[PDB]
């Protein structure tokens, strides 16, 4: 059923809360035993948001391999994402170790360091060229190379150096800075242009490791980003784009990380985003 007609039917009936609860009821439940070990308590921002054991990213070290991050592998779309929590003061070194070990080109950040007057993640990248950051626990150096500040987002070029081998790589930081404190954006136009700019960079392409995506918990905004990306890609691949079922794609993605899409308003925004994105590719 053409998802726009499905959209108008749920709007006119006001049944977004009912649709969302049905997804919550059908979603996969897999064990998260490593996340709940006592040694990992200070590695988790939220007690109720944990990676499944089968899809968790493992750090390459014998001491403690744990990070709150999941590999979302979308087989038909041929896209992979790592979804992770905003880094904590004691996990910033782990975060950059993961970027290095997974060969990621891009980091997508969908939150502000401070929102609603509280800290939603650590200040994990350098703010000035001449003040680099050293992570002694993982033996990495991070330098700001350049910064481009636009009205709805900021792009930064970073250099990550493995101090063990003296290899260096360029990482692109894509920072969406205007997600409102309450609810979701009124129009999806600035969000869709942000995805297109991430795509344009090469960060989502198969010649690199998976893109690293985060918000505060790594399920809400983060879920919206990868759901919209994957749905639009399937519409360009499938003989009949009308066959793309956003609820079925969300359930597939929830096999790899719990809780993706946190509210019925986030669900409606994802639809809205996918509906408006299809008109620029297929319509005019
Ligand atoms: O701001 C803009 N004006 C022209 C547009 C050209 C590329 N854009 C696009 O394809 O539209 C939505 C979308 C984004 C990703 C995938 C499918 C559809 C992003 C917005 C751009």
From Swiss-Prot:
Keywords: Acetylation, Endoplasmic reticulum, Hydrolase, Membrane, Oxidation, Phosphoprotein, Protein phosphatase, S-nitrosylation. The modification S-nitrosocysteine is found at residue 215. The modification N-acetylmethionine is found at residue 1. It is an enzyme of class 3 (hydrolase). The keyword Secreted does not apply. GO terms for molecular function: cadherin binding; enzyme binding; ephrin receptor binding; insulin receptor binding; non-membrane spanning protein tyrosine phosphatase activity; protein kinase binding; protein phosphatase 2A binding; protein tyrosine phosphatase activity. The chain holds residues 1 to 284 of 435 of the full protein. There is a cross-link at residues 215-216 (N,N-(cysteine-1,S-diyl)serine (Cys-Ser)). The modification Phosphotyrosine is found at residues 20, 66. Tyrosine-protein phosphatase which acts as a regulator of endoplasmic reticulum unfolded protein response. Mediates dephosphorylation of EIF2AK3/PERK; inactivating the protein kinase activity of EIF2AK3/PERK. May play an important role in CKII- and p60c-src-induced signal transduction cascades. May regulate the EFNA5-EPHA3 signaling pathway which modulates cell reorganization and cell-cell repulsion. May also regulate the hepatocyte growth factor receptor signaling pathway through dephosphorylation of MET. This is Tyrosine-protein phosphatase non-receptor type 1. Belongs to the protein-tyrosine phosphatase family. Non-receptor class 1 subfamily.
């Amino acid at each position: 059923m053409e998802m726009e007609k499905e959209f108008e039917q749920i709007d006119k009936s006001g049944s977004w809360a009912a649709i969302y609860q049905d997804i919550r009821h059908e979603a996969s439940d897999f064990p998260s035993r490593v996340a709940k070990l006592p040694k990992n308590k200070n590695r988790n921002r939220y007690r109720d948001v944990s990676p499944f054991d089968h899809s968790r990213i493992k750090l390459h070290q014998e001491d403690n391999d744990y990070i709150n991050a999941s590999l979302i592998k979308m087989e038909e779309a041929q896209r992979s994402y790592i979804l992770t929590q905003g880094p904590l003061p004691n996990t910033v070194g782990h975060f950059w170790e993961m970027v290095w070990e997974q060969k990621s080109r891009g980091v997508v950040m969908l939150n502000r360091v401070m929102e609603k007057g509280s800290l939603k993640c650590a200040q994990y990248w350098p703010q000035k060229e001449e003040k680099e950051m050293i992570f002694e626990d993982t033996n990495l150096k991070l330098t700001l190379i350049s910064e481009d500040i636009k009205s709805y987002y900021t792009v930064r070029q970073l250099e990550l150096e493995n101090l063990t081998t003296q290899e260096t790589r360029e990482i692109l930081h894509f920072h969406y800075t205007t997600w409102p404190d309450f609810g979701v954006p009124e129009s999806p136009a600035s969000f869709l242009n942000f995805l297109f700019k991430v795509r344009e960079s090469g960060s989502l392409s198969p010649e690199h490791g998976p893109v690293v995506v985060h918000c505060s918990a790594g399920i809400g905004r983060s879920g919206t980003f990868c759901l919209a990306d994957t749905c639009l890609l399937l519409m360009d691949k499938r003989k009949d784009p009308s066959s793309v079922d956003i609820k079925k794609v969300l359930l597939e993605m929830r096999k790899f990380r719990m809780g993706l899409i946190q509210t019925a308003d986030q669900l409606r925004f994802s639809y809205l985003a996918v509906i408006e994105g299809a008109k620029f590719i297929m319509g005019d």
